[PDB]
Ligand binder design. Sequence first.
Ligand SMILES: [Fe+3]
Length: 329
Amino acid sequence: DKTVRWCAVSEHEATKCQSFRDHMKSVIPSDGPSVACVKKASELDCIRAIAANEADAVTLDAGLVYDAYLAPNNLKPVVAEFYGSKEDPQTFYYAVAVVKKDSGFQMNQLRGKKSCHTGLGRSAGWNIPIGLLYCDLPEPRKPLEKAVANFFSGSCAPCADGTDFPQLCQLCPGCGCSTLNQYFGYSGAFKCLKDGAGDVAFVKHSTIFENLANKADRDQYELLCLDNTRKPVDEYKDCHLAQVPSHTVVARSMGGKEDLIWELLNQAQEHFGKDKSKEFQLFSSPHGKDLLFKDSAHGFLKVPPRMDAKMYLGYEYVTAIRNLREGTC
Ligand SMILES: [Fe+3]
């Protein structure tokens, strides 16, 4: 029963945040918790702000959860999104590589292609695909951006430094790290492919389904599998790059209001979860896709007491991330 300062990244998320706040007021008693909205330019800024006691919560892709746990931020995950359905919640998802039908190349022929990424340091759009191509990348592999810029003949990697690596923002000038960059995120990375700027988009299994309603439109796309073959977008379970942890809401390790955060989100998913309301929806919005939370999420699950980021992500994934900034071949 106090205020939770939610960190909204840019204009769109801010708008949804304002709606979230108002609708919650109309249904949460006077002794219930409330939402306040803080607008930031990026997720990176949100991490700082929470650590500096300027905000209290923000949902992050598991890839960014690692950087949020690192000093001097020291944030911890408190609430996780789950996908699939309520009967059988999936606390993970599939990273896939989407391409257009008959484009003519396999996984082993990516050098020279144009790639569309959700964002720098993110699970599906960066960490996984780059981790798999790592050794096939040219040297030096430090900084990593360098190698990626030289592997592909241009790409869109939101949040990257366009000054230092201009090839990385070739498909999306500036490399905007928010929805203001139309090619940002899952659906942004997909549009980058659909519009014809890129040859491959690294997103999740639900992305194409979230964007193309007709099975006939989806039939014009395919998935690149690790065995250098292609498969239909609905056969992602046999044709994906990896399984990664679900997105999660992070908070301060000290005086982080984890109790209020859970109390709020739990009431939120009950009143405005999937199919629960005509006035407001927590997992969709006329203002855009994946705002504040993923459209593909069906609810939340409280993370076990005082769990750290390494434990949440898993040693295998943590290990994958570490090598990404070091590794040999
Ligand atoms: Fe993600």
